[PDB]
């Protein structure tokens, strides 16, 4: 059941989840093609486009999924799984809101499974940097989606 409020609550909840994960990761440490908003997407004030922005939100969130799957193997297994599962609900909500149309693109499964093994073959240091970069980038994307959705 979709509501702007439920979508807003879902983003805000995942953001607090990312924060709590970043905290329980930065106490052991103390390129990637991650989704990122650009002006052309229509999510910022300058060149704001409702239709293209909603497509970029759903696309970016579907692309982030391989990276959230990576986080699951990387002791608070319930917390990292909760981030992944809470994201899937966010995608469903936005797919339901966009019910007017879909022309995305959805990512290739075998390309993701290969990227996943490549990320899992790195040493522990690189794996901790990968985690930091995934979490920061996902936070940046969710914060822009949050701002944009308010006007859509």
């Amino acid at each position: 059941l979709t509501s702007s409020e439920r979508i807003d609550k879902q983003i805000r909840y995942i953001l607090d989840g990312i924060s709590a994960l970043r905290k329980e990761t930065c106490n052991k440490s103390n390129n990637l093609n991650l989704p990122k908003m650009a002006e052309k997407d229509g999510c910022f004030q300058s060149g704001f486009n409702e239709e293209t922005c909603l497509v970029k939100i759903i696309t970016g969130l579907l692309e982030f999924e391989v990276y959230l799957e990576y986080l699951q193997n990387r002791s608070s297994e319930e917390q990292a799984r909760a981030v992944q599962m809470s994201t899937k609900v966010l995608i469903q909500f936005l797919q339901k809101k966009a019910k007017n149309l879909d022309a995305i693109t959805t990512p290739d499964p075998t390309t993701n499974a290969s990227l996943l093994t490549k990320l899992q073959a790195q040493n522990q240091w690189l794996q901790d940097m990968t985690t930091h970069l995934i979490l920061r980038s996902f936070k940046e994307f969710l914060q822009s989606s949050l701002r944009a959705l308010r006007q859509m």
Partner: antibody
Framework: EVQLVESGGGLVQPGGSLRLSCAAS????????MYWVRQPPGKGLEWVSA????????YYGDSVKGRFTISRDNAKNTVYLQMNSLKPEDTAVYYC?????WGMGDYWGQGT | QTVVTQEPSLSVSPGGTVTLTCGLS?????????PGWFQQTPGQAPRALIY???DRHSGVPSRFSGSISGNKAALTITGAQPEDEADYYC?????????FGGGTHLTVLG
């Protein structure tokens, strides 16, 4: 500064039709959700309807859902409130506004 | 159907502190409800004071402040002035819509 000018309300017969306009100036109109609030005589504030930045999404109060229609226009920077099947219960001062965003707060007009 | 609840009337003495609350029947008020506070002087158009829970509108005195305390949205006036005697309407974004509370008549004593 930012300005919002409501027009053109008036006397109308029950079951009648009216079209409200809201001329916006001084802000990136195409980048904001716009909304309408009504104030019946001697009564509190009542939310009427809302329109997303590009008009894709429209929302209404369940006491006017079937009767009212919200529309938007750019580069004319105007929002409209098409009011059909008008009832004495719709007698009020009508205000247009922008939802906060991009470092700006909710600005309301003078009313019609 | 959700109900936005606010105290019908409240009062304060000059230079005193007063808190106006705004709540839901369907549970707790969160950041997602983007609470707004509007001041209305008689025969005048409403003026937005606080937006997005705690953000102050252009030219709003620093004595007016917003927050969420408990399960409700709150408006605190620190060092009330005679000019602060007015109606205060709260607005919460519930579902896909926005709902105003009945409003609070604040009297500055006495």
């Amino acid at each position: 500064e930012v300005q919002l000018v409501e027009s053109g309300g008036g006397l109308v017969q029950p079951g009648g039709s009216l079209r409200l306009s809201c001329a916006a100036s001084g802000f990136t109109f195409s980048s904001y959700r716009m909304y309408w609030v009504r104030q019946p005589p001697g009564k509190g504030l009542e939310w009427v309807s809302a329109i997303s930045a590009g008009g894709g999404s429209t929302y209404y109060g369940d006491s006017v859902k079937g009767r009212f229609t919200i529309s938007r226009d750019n580069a004319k920077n105007t929002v409209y409130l098409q009011m059909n099947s008008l009832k004495p219960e719709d007698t009020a001062v009508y205000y247009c506004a922008n939802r906060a965003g991009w470092g700006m707060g909710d600005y309301w007009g003078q009313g019609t | 159907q959700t109900v936005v609840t606010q105290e019908p009337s409240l009062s304060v003495s000059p230079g005193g502190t007063v808190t106006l609350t705004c709540g839901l029947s369907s549970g707790s008020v969160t950041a997602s409800n983007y609470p707004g506070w509007f001041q209305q002087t008689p025969g005048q158009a409403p003026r937005a004071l606080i937006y997005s829970t705690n953000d102050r509108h252009s030219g709003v005195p620093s004595r007016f402040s917003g927050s969420i305390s408990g399960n409700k949205a709150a408006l605190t006036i620190t060092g009330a002035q005679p000019e602060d005697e007015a109606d205060y309407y709260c607005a919460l974004d519930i579902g896909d819509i926005t709902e105003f509370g009945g409003g609070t008549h604040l009297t500055v004593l006495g």
